RNA sequence: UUCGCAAGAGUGAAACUUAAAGAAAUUGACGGAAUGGCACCACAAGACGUGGAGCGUGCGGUUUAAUUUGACCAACACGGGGAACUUUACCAGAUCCGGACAGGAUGAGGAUUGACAGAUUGAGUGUUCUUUCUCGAUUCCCUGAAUGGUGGUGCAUGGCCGCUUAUGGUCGGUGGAGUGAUUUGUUUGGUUGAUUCCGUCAACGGACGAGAUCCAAGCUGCCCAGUAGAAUUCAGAAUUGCCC
RNA sequence: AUUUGCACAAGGUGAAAUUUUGGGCAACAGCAGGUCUGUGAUGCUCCUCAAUGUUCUGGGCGACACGCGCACUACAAUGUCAGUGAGAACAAGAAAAACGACUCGAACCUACUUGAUCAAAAGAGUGGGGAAACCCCGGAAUCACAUAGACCCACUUGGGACCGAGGAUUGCAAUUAUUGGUCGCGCAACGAGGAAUGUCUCGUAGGCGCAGCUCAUCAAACUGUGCCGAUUACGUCCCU
């Protein structure tokens, strides 16, 4: 017998057009690129309401 | 019912129950039955102990969430088992899939992987949520069947080990004897640790085991040493005579 | 003892005199002996995604009124301390398709020196060794000492169990003391052990250490090794 609720398995979410919202004829990238040279271009830092985050190298820029 | 003084004797069922009971021989095993041998896992002559104390360790019991389990001469410092984590098989929790593959959904208008921060939490563990980034077709979702398991069953097994069993034991062929199971060979005697030999003989011929082989140790030959040593010369240095 | 034969007993010879000594191997039949906890040995069966798989965290396998088997230490003067001497043998020792340099280095063992103008245990350097090469002339302790040393028959300078404080080391982690080292505790029993019971015949028993093994750390275990070394019998079938 267990008392804690069962932990669900993590499912990946999606935006279904996530590349469109990164860019903005003239094209501008709405996401600041990763300054880390290893990640390079094409890796965009996340835009959280608190800080910026890189998916590859986990670099974090606090506001 | 007859006989008897009586004890009883003669005569003599059935109901019911039961698959054997018996008989003679054979091979084992056993004997508080004989005979001959043998062993310090036996004794004799003894020696050191153990059993008494403290402590180490293993086993049991008790306790515990768990105190994981096997083994009870031939279990108990034994599983090479002297476990802090691991080991670990037990207990309280928490991850991962290491469910290949096949079939069917979703699916690059994205199947999926991994994560900073703040919460969850034992965890500064993305284990889960909020949040979005990231990786891209490796996964994920469902059914089947696979996989792994110090899960069971050693009374399903292999292999290995222990023990019977440290003694001298074991088996055919052909021949003899019995209806046969079986027996002789494989033996009365002496000898040997020895079914070891010598003799004897309804046997003769063999095959294992014992012995032999093998490994060390003690004596020794050859060979050999800038990875072993020795002796002898010079050269240096030390003691040097009255001392008690 | 002997018709013979097979042999035996003493003594010679000899390093060795009867399976030379000690081991290894060891038949045929078996046992419902043990092992499914060695294996990618294995049949059947059980679990299999909040798993009996796997990993991680923490506990446990060590818990203690007790019983039992094995071992270690003792009960002291054939002694305990303190000092000095002479003196073994088996043995072990370091690493990669990875880490740095560019094939070599480091892991392992050990010697020497310092620490040290002041305890041990440490900590550090400098070398050496792939092991007949370094350790190493392997300074083991039982032992010895005419050491003119202390103790003097007492649970005592026997015994060293239990426990308290300091400090060091191994490890990612030492609390349930990991293990050494220091000062205390010693007033914990134990003064030779009932009934029963184990092993042993010569370099043996007993006593004494040392190495390997398990091992990052830890031996009262085991597997070997050497050292000091006897009493007794060399017989029997009374017991098993
Ligand atoms: K016949
Ligand atoms: K037999
Ligand atoms: K002390
Ligand atoms: Mg009558
Ligand atoms: Mg005898
Ligand atoms: Mg026996
Ligand atoms: Mg044992
Ligand atoms: Mg664990
Ligand atoms: Mg298995
Ligand atoms: Mg069996
Ligand atoms: Mg078997
Ligand atoms: Mg016969
Ligand atoms: Mg005889
Ligand atoms: Mg005979
Ligand atoms: Mg145990
Ligand atoms: Mg003392
Ligand atoms: Mg052991
Ligand atoms: Na099985």
DSSP string, A37-51: TTT-TT-BEEE-SSE
How far is Cα A47 from Cα A54, in angstroms, rounded to an integer? 9
Measured from the CB, is A15 under 7 Å from any atom of strand B?
yes
Resolution in A: 2.7
Nearest-10 Cα torsion for A6, A8, A52, A26: -160
A62 touches strand B (CB under 7 A): no
How far, in Å, CA of A18 to CA of A38, rounded?
Answer: 23
CB A34 within 8 A of CB A40: yes
Distance (Å, rounded) from C-alpha A60 to C-alpha A63?
10
User: Residue A54 in contact with residue A46, Cβ under 8 Å?
Assistant: yes
Phi (first) and psi of residue A9, to 5 degrees: -75, 145
Phi, psi of A29 (to 5 degrees): -85, 120
A56 CB neighbour count, 10 Å cutoff: 14
Task: Give me A58's structure tokens.
Answer: 């986990």
Only one residue has tokens 């990640």, namely A39
Output the CA A1–ligand 8 centroid distance in Å.
22
The C1' atom of C85 and the CA atom of A31 lie apart, in whole Å, by 90
């Amino acid at each position: 017998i267990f008392t804690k609720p069962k932990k669900p398995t993590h499912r990946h979410k999606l935006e279904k057009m996530r590349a469109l919202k990164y860019f903005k004829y003239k094209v501008e990238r709405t996401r600041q690129d990763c300054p880390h040279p290893q990640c390079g271009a094409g890796v965009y830092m996340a835009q959280h309401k608190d800080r910026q985050y890189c998916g590859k190298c986990h670099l974090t820029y606090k506001a």
